[PDB]
DNA sequence: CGAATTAATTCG
DNA sequence: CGAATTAATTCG
């Protein structure tokens, strides 16, 4: 995935 | 594993 | 609905 918390 | 990053959740 | 807090994820 990309950096940081995944978008929901 | 930690900081960094990024978004979700909480709570006024 | 926003700022503060919390959480999930990558990279070194």
Author numbering: 34 to 41
Paper passage:
In our studies we have used a peptide with nine amino acids identical to those found in DBD3 and similar to those found in DBD2. As shown in the Methods section our crystals contain four complexes which are very similar. The geometry of the duplex and the central sequence of the AT-hook (PRGRP) are practically identical in the four complexes. On the other hand the external AT-hook terminal amino acids vary in each of the four complexes present in our crystal. The DNA duplex has a clear bend, localized in the region of base pairs 5 and 6. It determines an angle of 24° between the lower five bases and the upper seven bases of the duplex. The minor groove in one of them is occupied by the AT-hook, whereas the other region shows a clear spine of hydration, typical for the AATT sequence. The minor groove is wide in the region occupied by the AT-hook, with phosphate-phosphate distances in the range 12–13 Å. A clear hydrogen bond of the main chain NH group of Arg-38 is formed with one thymine oxygen. However the main lesson of our work is that the AT-hook can bind to a strongly distorted DNA molecule, whereas most models of interaction assume that the B form of DNA remains practically unchanged upon binding.
